[PDB]
Design a protein around this ligand. Structure first.
Ligand SMILES: Cc1c(Cl)cc(N2CCN(C(=O)c3cc(=O)[nH]c(=O)[nH]3)CC2)cc1Cl
Ligand SMILES: Cc1c(Cl)cc(N2CCN(C(=O)c3cc(=O)[nH]c(=O)[nH]3)CC2)cc1Cl
Lengths: 306, 306
């Protein structure tokens, strides 16, 4: 029993983190095979932050302008290139700790683990969701750029996020590992704002199923509803509308508890219109939307990895 | 003078189009160096459309199950792999007509050219925009899957779109060339719906500047407005809000015409609240939002490519 904000074990990723220095700027890089990946704004100075021309800035660099350190061992840069917003540094030594990996782009509402790093050294791991406005509510300080987000599927690490910047509202923005930003953001130190966020409805429903599995039942009722009736209430409270695909995804949780999805939607409708009245669910006084249906199954039924 | 829906010259792309057959299914592929890229649902049959397991379907295939034709020359498949939603077929011959290229992921509101193809043969070219709901309003018939979208930057072809499917509403969905879908869609023949579309405001403003450059001035007025006052009216009419970044992008057009952006916004406010009253702008009775500021500059000031 129990329910926690659970991250993936980070060991396979810790061995890929390196320190990348260019000039007076130091941040984190990801070392897979003989390539080091890092944010391209490492080649920027204070004079170029507001409007950098990265093509010009890169042509004025040579391999010896890039210092790469894996712990205390230094890696020799033998080539460099730019792929969208990430810098690819070819080094003379292939990482012997390279795991089975792939580069994936995730969708809003999906979760992943973040290995926060400083000076190439892992500091902590935590779980977060990609928000519908393509930001993440992370925890990052100065020097954390190049930290990566990942999921583990069996023996394979799926890298999905590299950290680039913090927005004025305190939320965080980055790219996939091909260097393409999540959301309408650019790597320039200008004032950019995220659009309005919404609550991830399918995740809230999954979390309510986790509550029932763990013995929190006070919010259930006998009523039922339709998808269109529910979605009418949901839009009023800034909730993402619910699709038939979402209902299918929640199938294994409806079967394990014997509570139909549309039945659980009726409970959620009541919680939105009346609140929780000083009661808690799984130790929270708010509706939690950063657990996917898969996260719940993984924690309330059991999955490990090799 | 004049203003047209202008596409990029397609010659550099026509030489990369091939036909890919697997079983009874034939669609289009993109042949760059010694790799052929195509939608992975080419390995699906009618029995798997609703819920394909692509890992299983691919392990049951061998290289000789894939017939690749470049005109009449046949290409020998020596390897195959899956990267997200695209199939990568390694062939024995590198395309001698491979142009300088890169793979880019575009943002909503940006435009590109589509080379519609059938049986590996180019049929037509047209311009379209990525909608804010991550669909495109294309023109595609049966057999068009694998057609690609592209921009040309100097001598370099930037591939940004590969066509996968048509949604029930008649709009179209696809992936970038790394196989990651635009929008919340999956390559399964289930019922999926696009979210609500909005009008791309910065593009409408660019188009109004093109009108002024070409002698349509009847909608101008002496008034001005603020960003927050404009955005309040815009949201009422399902227009994307306007940012300071957008104002900067429109700079070259404001300078060429001597009409400040916030002045042009005041004209747009009036057109939204009063309509056009049987008058036309650049031969249209509706406000056009599929030309970017760069498209206008390119056509109203002059850019060619090598
Ligand atoms: C072009 C450009 C851009 Cl776009 C960003 C930076 N910065 C690099 C330094 N930096 C952090 O390390 C950091 C991350 C974080 O999440 N929170 C926090 O407080 N600090 C801020 C971003 C520099 C340049 Cl030249
Ligand atoms: C898993 C899967 C998926 Cl997701 C899609 C298809 N289709 C392949 C055939 N096809 C077209 O060629 C087509 C495109 C278009 O835009 N308009 C139109 O009328 N037809 C439809 C999609 C097949 C499979 Cl097995």
């Amino acid at each position: 029993s129990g329910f926690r904000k659970m991250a993936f074990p980070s060991g396979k990723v810790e061995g890929c983190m390196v320190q990348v220095t260019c000039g007076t700027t130091t941040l984190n890089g990801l070392w897979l095979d003989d390539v080091v990946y890092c944010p391209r704004h490492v080649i920027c100075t204070s004079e170029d932050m507001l409007n950098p021309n990265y093509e010009d800035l890169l042509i004025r660099k040579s391999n010896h302008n890039f210092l790469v350190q894996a712990g205390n061992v230094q890696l020799r840069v033998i080539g460099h290139s730019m792929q969208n917003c990430v810098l690819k540094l070819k080094v003379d030594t292939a990482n012997p700790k390279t795991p089975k990996y792939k580069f994936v782009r995730i969708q809003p509402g999906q979760t992943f683990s973040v290995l926060a790093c400083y000076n190439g050294s892992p500091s902590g791991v935590y779980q977060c969701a990609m928000r519908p406005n393509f930001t993440i509510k992370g925890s990052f300080l100065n020097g954390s750029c190049g930290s990566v987000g990942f999921n583990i599927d069996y023996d394979c690490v799926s890298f999905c996020y590299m950290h680039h910047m913090e927005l004025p509202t305190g939320v965080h923005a980055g790219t996939d590992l091909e260097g393409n930003f999540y959301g309408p953001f650019v790597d320039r130190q200008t004032a950019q704002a995220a659009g309005t966020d919404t609550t991830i409805t399918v995740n809230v429903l999954a979390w309510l199923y986790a509550a029932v599995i763990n013995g929190d039942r006070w919010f259930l009722n006998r009523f039922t509803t339709t998808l269109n009736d529910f979605n009418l209430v949901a839009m009023k409270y800034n909730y993402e509308p619910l699709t038939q695909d979402h209902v299918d995804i929640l199938g294994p949780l409806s079967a394990q508890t014997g509570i139909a999805v549309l039945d659980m939607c009726a409970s959620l409708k009541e919680l939105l219109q009346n609140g929780m009245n000083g009661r808690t669910i799984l130790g929270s006084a708010l509706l939690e939307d950063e657990f996917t249906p898969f996260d719940v199954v993984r924690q309330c039924s059991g999955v490990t990895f090799q």
